Ligand SMILES: CC1=NN(c2ccccc2)C(=O)C1
Ligand SMILES: CC1=NN(c2ccccc2)C(=O)C1
């Protein structure tokens with residue numbers, strides 16, 4: 230009875246791991262495509278599956294971090310959203326923390342995305358007229374040339390400054406979408422998606 | 434591009450169907466075992482997966498009804514829980530409605546469970562001192578000998594009447610657990626559980 234219960238629990242853990250990879254792939258695809266409602270529903274499903282998982286491999290922690298990173302990026306302009314226990318941390322600051330924690334290559338693309346999130350974390354505060362909050366986000370992030378231009382823009386209250394149009398929110402999203410394409414290629418071969426693709430193909 | 438998007442959406446629908454069957458099996462097992470916290474977490478996951486499914490086969494609608502039925506039975510004593518748009522309907526009354534909708538055999542066990550839910554729908558109102566609500570649940574359900582004993586118990590305010598000890602909440606749960614064992618046997622062969630069981634066995 231206890232041996233059967235144990236084997237069942239191990240099988241549920243295997244299946245939850247397969248569901249996590251599939252939901253991550255679906256979340257990545259919805260983000261890349263701009264399917265806002267599918268992203269919201271898929272995120273809700275990923276969150277619930279994650280609460281049913283206890284022990285995680287390094288690969289599963291990376292998968293969860295990718296889901297959490299895209300969720301904060303999708304909420305980047307929602308300044309009322311609180312992703313951390315410290316209520317002062319904005320969504321883009323929370324995405325920046327996860328970006329620096331993922332076990333991944335620090336290639337040129339990694340650093341470009343990092344710097345684009347930093348500029349936009351300040352930009353989104355300025356665009357909402359939250360000038361003192363922009364300065365507080367600046368101090369938390371920064372923790373010379375790039376740093377000093379940003380402090381000058383904050384002090385002038387230059388909300389629609391051309392610097393934010395050159396390193397825009399759209400540019401940040403496009404660079405992140407290039408990274409998402411690589412996650413999509415890497416996870417397209419995971420168990421659940423492969424088996425489901427084989428079913429659809431066999432009916433064609 | 435549209436052909437690929439279409440094939441991907443079909444594969445996501447296949448995978449969501451496999452996840453629904455697996456989550457139903459896990460929910461049934463947690464209910465049978467009395468694993469309250471695992472039931473709560475599994476229910477949250479089933480709800481989210483169901484919102485990501487659009488077209489349902491007759492088999493998938495039956496699977497969803499089984500999940501909804503067990504959720505209302507688990508909440509049978511939570512008289513503040515509102516499962517229907519009509520706020521007057523109690524959780525056991527909502528379970529009774531689903532029980533009468535499932536495409537299943539009306540064998541002796543089906544009717545015994547039905548009558549046990551009817552008695553307990555009244556019993557739970559009486560036990561909370563909600564005498565007028567017990568009479569209202571009675572009128573909505575009933576909708577001669579069984580009916581008249583119940584109306585007499587309600588009018589006397591006989592909360593701890595021996596009739597409710599003979600056709601108890603425990604007796605209702607045990608009969609429902611016998612039905613759950615049959616659902617467990619039937620869904621143990623579904624794709625995701627079978628594949629996960631094969632993985633665990635191969636590591637022994
Ligand atoms: C709201 C939140 N969603 N999430 C989240 C977590 C895992 C997968 C997808 C999303 C957070 O961490 C906070
Ligand atoms: C609360 C509720 N949970 N549910 C539910 C639905 C599907 C699966 C599991 C549970 C309801 O219908 C209302």
Ligand SMILES: [Ca+2]
Nearest residue numbers: 308309310316
């Ligand atoms: Ca805020």
Ligand SMILES: [Ca+2]
Nearest residue numbers: 512513514520
């Ligand atoms: Ca109530």
